[model samples]
Target: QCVKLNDGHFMPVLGFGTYAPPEVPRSKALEVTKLAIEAGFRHIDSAHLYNNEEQVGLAIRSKIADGSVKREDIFYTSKLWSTFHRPELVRPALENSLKKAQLDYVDLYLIHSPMSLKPGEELSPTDENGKVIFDIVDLCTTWEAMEKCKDAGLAKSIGVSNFNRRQLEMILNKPGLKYKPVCNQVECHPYFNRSKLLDFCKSKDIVLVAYSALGSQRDKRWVDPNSPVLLEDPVLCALAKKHKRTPALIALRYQLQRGVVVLAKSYNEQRIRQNVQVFEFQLTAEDMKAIDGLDRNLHYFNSDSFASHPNYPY
Candidate 1:
């Protein structure tokens, strides 16, 4: 149920994602995160840009106080947002996330994305012409700061998110590479299986953490409404029926069987509880192949808004 990171830390194969859209109340994060912990999720994913670190911290602290879990038993991951990608600002950004989470240290910290944004209070600052303001900082310099954070013991491990293969190689081949990324978090599901990327990471001993595994929460503000529904695909529905499981469970089990760490996001208590049942069922090789056939190279979060930036990974 857990995979060993290159840094010698074990990360739970299944994690609870804590990204809620604007319409969802931030307080819901506190409630559902606590429920997730109680439902046996050992990893919780959060980010500085999510603006719900305080609530997530509250949930984890509450669980610890009740003796249901302990700090060392849980794997907490927080990300450094692009606005703070400046080399000098990396440590401060990490410190800010730590302060928000009210934790001494996080199990993992990731560079949120390869693209860097302008230094400002706004996380996604844009100019008058509706173009994203770009900050030109070599990601290698940012990686050095990440190494410093690990050396200072602020994060037990460090990695990246939304980085393409070329971007990952850049870090791997950096002149003084102090550390290789332990994982690469990205949008992966039956629709976008990322088979090649997964193979590449495995060869490097890097775990691939998947987001949008259940077709995402389908937040209209960020996700395209026209995208095909992952949970409602005819093929997935047929497989779910054959296995006597929900389509979501089938989707999650497929990822786990392939050795990918998956994140399940939901505020609904029943859904959160049901998602953990992925461990209960086993997907046969035939089932795995059937699901593998569903990959259409679909991407739910294409980062089109930042496509003009020179550093855009996708």
Candidate 2:
């Protein structure tokens, strides 16, 4: 389960994603997260924007108290939201998440998006003014704060999310940086393989965490109703049928086989249990090729609006 990072920490290749349904009671997130731990999910991906950190933290603490899992066994990851992108507020923003999670440190801390919004202001990539406001968070400046988190012992490792190769190159170019980013998190799936970015990160020894690994079933608002459905695809269905498993399982297994960490989210006990079972099976080379053909460069969530800003997709 150890996918070695550039900085030498091992991240479990399979983790649980906490993008719960709005109608899902807070208790459900708490209980379901605990169930995920009991089901052998050691890594957890969360965000302040998800607005469930308190519940997730409570669930984790409950699991530890009951001996269902240990704190060390759990790898906790949280994203720094866009609204907190300014240089000075970065640490405080991370601290907000930390306080909510009831943890002193996060295993992996990421910049949620390359674009930063003003504090307390919510704006899409294209606002009504047609003005793409860019505060220009110097990657080095933000990264310097991230390094302080490591120095202050607030985070074990740091990384970026939704970043492209060009943005990462900018960070690599920065000098006097004590710590480098250890990974890049993005929206990856069989449908949107993002092989170029994955290969680049692999070459750099940076781990890649893939969200929407099962086609973003819960993201009804963002996902196109007309878009190709991965879970229903004939190819994935055929592979699952051959393995006597669900289509979601096959998709996730293909990613894990390719060395990408899969973030599978679900509130249903049966689905969550089944999602983790991907570790039990390995995809053959032929299976990989079939899966690779599913790539269409489709992005469920694009940072284009962020990119339009002067300093974007960092």
Candidate 3:
């Protein structure tokens, strides 16, 4: 289930997501990241915004020291935060992440989001009214800096996250586009299948990497409390029962069978071990169709606070 990227590197079909809720202890990141590696997860998805890059790096280094895996054997992905979207700051931001992780280079780097913020301001700059302060930098320019990162060998591959179709086309249609984005990471699950977006990316040879595949995002600050729980969906629950598996495994397998790279996030040792079980079984066409019918275009993290920003790509 490995997909070849435009840059000729192979990305595993399944990755372990490293986002921890604010309430969770930061040390949990180091603890679970090591456990995830021990559980046979080679691909790790992390970000500067998560505020746990140091721990993530420690976990990777610890594993390498113990002979579990080598640096080349692991596929590590990190992102440039919005505050560093300015072209000149791109390389430096990536350097900071690398330094924090104590790594020489990352397998892939991504622009955290389409929206930009004030260059020297706080990570989430806000106006007097407490609204988000938007920095109006053309994404193509930021992308150009990203290309420079690739050319300099700091990032083996570069791409964008949370970009809509039009945003993706902006880079694809750039006059002097150096390299096409190899992947578009976004919120995806049975509730919001993104069927059309997935088809478009496939048509352009871009792999769509799905986060929140298990449906419970675990971030209370960003996720709405009243939103319906994805794991508890009647359709998925029934399907899980039919297959004699957990709803989480059913959801993860659904994406892998559809040719989408999926990320499973968890800190619990048992759950982390359970996520890799997705590779153990196959889904029937009838089952796929039943799950396909579950799409309601629901998104768990809408970023409504940034709706007024001109480049908002929700």
Specify the highest-lDDT model's number: 1
- lDDT of each residue in 104-152, candidate 2, tens digit only: 7888888887766666545334356886555656667888787888788
- Give residue 89's lDDT in candidate 2 (0 to 100): 78
Whole-model lDDT per candidate = 0.93, 0.82, 0.90
Off by over 4 Å in 3: none
lDDT (10s digit) by residue, model 3, range 1-314: 47899889888888999998778889999999999999989999999999899999999999999998999888999999999988999999999999999999998999989988887747888789988788889899999999999999999999889899999999999999999999999888998999999999999989999998888564677778887799998988998889889999999999999989999999999999998999888889999999899888778886778887777776
| lDDT per residue as tens, model 1, 1-314 | 78999999999999999999878888999999999999999999999989999999999999999999999999999999999899999999989888988999999999999989999899989899988788988999999999999999999999999988999999999998988999999989999999999999999989999999999887777678998999999988998898899999999999999999999998999999999999998988998999999999888875667777887766
* Model 1 TM-score, 2 decimals: 0.98
Error of 1 at 20 (Å): 0.5
In model 1, how large is the Cα lDDT of residue 20? 91
lDDT of 3: 0.90
Error in Å for residue 277 of model 2 = 0.9
Candidate 2 — which residues are off by over 4 angstroms? 121-134, 302-307, 310-314
Give the clashing pairs for model 3.
none
TM-score of 3: 0.97
